[PDB]
């Protein structure tokens, strides 16, 4: 509380007002009141300086066990997978895609499960650097095994090769990664613009023009793979590989489509969770819609583990 | 119609979803503007996948 | 703006002090802050209250 001056009346004669919000007073009989320090706030009392809440997508987080969870079930299924195809190394199915763009593929997998976990918890520097270059070489090294492994592309291309194509379609995005975090990498930004009694950490990309680039990049190779897989879905190659892929396509379009008003909208630690569940939510469509029926092939109903069917 | 019951049930899945940490921490206009966004895409799914 | 006390000098010897948001002060050389009513908010210039 601090003095306030009555009209008319001396100095001895005062009236307690108290501290207005933000600012403390700890010593008694104070004329004035102190601003509590940068980084620190206003207590219940106004007498203290508590430090202000720093809000992040914490591991303890209901949020961040939740998507923990399901991150750590995406590797966990994506090993199950990459483990099939390893003790079934030589089956028909298993050869007759290219088995090596499979273990790729799934090690690709792999890294965008993997990516998600580099959005839960304090953001460094590092961190913040690293978070969407992962997800965006990770997922592309995916559509590009994907993109292979369709018809009228690796011969489009051709007037092993796979491995080409593949190598090019990453190291576009690497490049742009490297431009981007040589020229204006990302950063780890305390905001105070928020509510005033909260530090929260953000990540601060450099440049949301090589963003741009990363995010069209990454959605003009899945729009190339849905293209090509459309005019092939009717083709029962592959057990239906082709439609399948249109699938996985159409889930990852779903998926970044209904991410725009969810990241617009989303305010907070939670916008990290936002960024988590569309990872999610594509890795997880495309292992389905590229894998499990096969995996269910392969380790149920076997007959069909044949030259003929596949 | 099996994949388009599937996907308009996805479709709706996944946005109701991605709006969780949307709806779990914001205040005011956009927190209707989240539920139409999602009432309309649910039912823009729909009626694109069944009919 | 409102008076501050300089202890150790006489009442005419005053400093001053920026009302804190949501109080306004209307006047000239007035000794506290006055709140805003109820559904009313401080201006930028603290200096009268808007809805
Ligand atoms: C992380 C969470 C939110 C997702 C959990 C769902 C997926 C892990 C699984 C569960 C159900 C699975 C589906 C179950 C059944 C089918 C039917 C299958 O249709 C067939 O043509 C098979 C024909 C046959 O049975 O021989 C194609 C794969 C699919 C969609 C499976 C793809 C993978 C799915 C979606
Ligand atoms: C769609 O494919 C992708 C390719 C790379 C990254 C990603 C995801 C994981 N992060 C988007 C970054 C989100 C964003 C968008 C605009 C402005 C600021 C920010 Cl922070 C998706
Ligand atoms: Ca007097
Ligand atoms: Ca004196």
Redesign the pocket.
């Given at each position: 509380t601090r003095k306030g001056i009555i009209e008319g009346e001396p100095t001895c004669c005062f009236e307690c007002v108290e501290c207005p919000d933000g600012e403390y007073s700890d010593e008694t009989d104070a004329s004035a009141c102190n601003k509590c320090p940068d980084d620190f706030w206003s207590n219940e009392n106004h007498t203290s300086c508590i430090a202000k809440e720093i809000e992040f997508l914490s591991w303890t987080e209901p949020f961040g066990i939740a998507l923990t969870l399901?991150a750590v079930?995406?590797i966990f299924?994506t090993a199950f997978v990459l483990g099939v195809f390893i003790k079934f190394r030589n089956t028909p199915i298993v050869k007759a895609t290219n088995r090596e763009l499979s273990y790729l593929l799934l090690f690709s997998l792999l890294c965008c499960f993997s990516s998600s976990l580099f959005f839960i918890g304090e953001p460094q520097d590092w961190t913040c650097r690293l978070r969407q270059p992962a997800f965006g070489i990770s997922f592309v090294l995916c559509i590009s095994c994907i993109l292979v492994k369709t018809n009228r592309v690796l011969l489009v291309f051709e007037a092993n090769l796979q491995f080409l194509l593949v190598f090019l379609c990453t190291f576009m995005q690497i490049v742009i990664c490297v431009i981007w975090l040589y020229t204006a990498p990302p950063s780890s930004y305390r905001n105070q613009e928020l509510e005033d009694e909260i530090i929260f950490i953000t990540c601060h990309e450099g440049s949301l023009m090589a963003l741009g680039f990363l995010i069209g990049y990454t959605c003009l190779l899945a729009a190339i793979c849905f293209f090509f897989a459309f005019k092939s879905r009717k083709l029962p190659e592959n057990f239906?590989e082709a439609k399948?892929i249109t699938f996985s396509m159409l889930i990852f379009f779903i998926v970044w489509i209904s991410f725009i008003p969810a990241y617009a909208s989303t305010y907070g630690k939670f916008v990290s969770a936002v960024e988590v569940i569309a990872i999610?939510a594509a890795s997880?469509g495309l292992?389905?819609?590229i894998f499990?029926?096969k995996i269910?092939?392969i380790l149920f109903?076997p007959s069909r583990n044949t030259i003929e069917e596949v």
């Open positions: 399901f079930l995406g299924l239906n399948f999610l997880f292992l389905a819609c499990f029926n269910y092939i109903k």
